[PDB]
Ligand binder design. Structure first.
Ligand code: ADP
Ligand code: ADP
Ligand code: ZN
Length: 213
């Protein structure tokens, strides 16, 4: 299974990705997670990417494409993968098609998670993420079993530096301007399936599973 999840920030892509990659035993490839790891490590790349991220702007295309090319070239991607947060622009989608061609890989499905914009702010400002493994929770919609602690690794949960109201507004605007047009790009391939993300987490997952089956 070679899969892309599409949808606005806050739609539930990372949450569903965790469930999907457990179901299929494939890697979860998230460009945001790569950037956040770089920031945690204090790398030059991370520190520079953070400047864009904290403004709610996209990190530039070529650097992001190169990270994904390198990641998809690893042996653990030969038997499937899930892209979550890439592509974000038409240039990235075209570049991904070229990467996949070079690797001899064909996409199987593109899942577009639809959620009304009005739901997204509270999902995002209440999001809490694990420092050590990147697992995603929500203060009320999907809490950890123990407050402030990751269920998987025991790591501390935190609020991302971009999950504040001002920055959210800009991220949603960027999504509508740059990223929403990708729905048409993947519709043309005959791979796109739309999912109602305005449901509880397990109902959304059920619908994704049904669509992929
Ligand atoms: N169906 C849902 N209903 C309510 N909250 C959800 C749902 N799916 C995810 N969440 C929560 O909303 C926030 C955004 O989900 P996330 O998976 O991080 O979205 P994305 O990766 O698309 O930005 C997280 O805090 C998550 O726990
Ligand atoms: N493919 C990408 N291209 C450019 N910037 C990206 C990409 N993926 C992540 N980013 C950067 O990381 C930020 C957070 O994105 P992400 O982790 O996917 O969270 P969200 O699910 O809330 O959109 C983006 O607003 C952007 O600055
Ligand atoms: Zn963790």
């Amino acid at each position: 299974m070679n899969l892309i999840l599409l949808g606005p920030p806050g739609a539930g892509k990372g949450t569903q990705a965790e469930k999907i990659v457990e179901e299929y035993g494939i890697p979860h490839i998230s460009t945001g997670d790569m950037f956040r790891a770089a920031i945690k490590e204090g790398t030059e790349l991370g520190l520079k990417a953070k400047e864009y991220m904290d403004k709610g702007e996209l990190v530039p295309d070529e650097v992001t494409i190169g990270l994904v090319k390198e990641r998809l070239s690893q042996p653990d991607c030969k038997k499937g993968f899930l892209l979550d947060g890439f592509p974000r622009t038409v240039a990235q989608a075209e570049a991904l098609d070229k990467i996949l061609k070079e690797l001899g890989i064909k996409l199987d499905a593109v899942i577009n998670i639809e959620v009304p914009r009005e739901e997204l702010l509270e999902r995002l400002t209440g999001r809490r993420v694990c420092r050590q493994c990147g697992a995603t929770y929500h203060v009320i919609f999907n809490p950890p079993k123990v407050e402030g602690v990751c269920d998987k690794c025991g790591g501390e949960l935190y609020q991302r530096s971009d999950d504040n109201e001002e920055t959210v507004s800009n991220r949603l605007d960027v999504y509508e301007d740059q990223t929403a047009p990708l729905i048409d790009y993947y519709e043309k391939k005959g791979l796109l399936k739309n999912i109602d993300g305005d449901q509880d987490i397990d109902a959304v997952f059920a619908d994704i599973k049904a669509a992929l089956g």
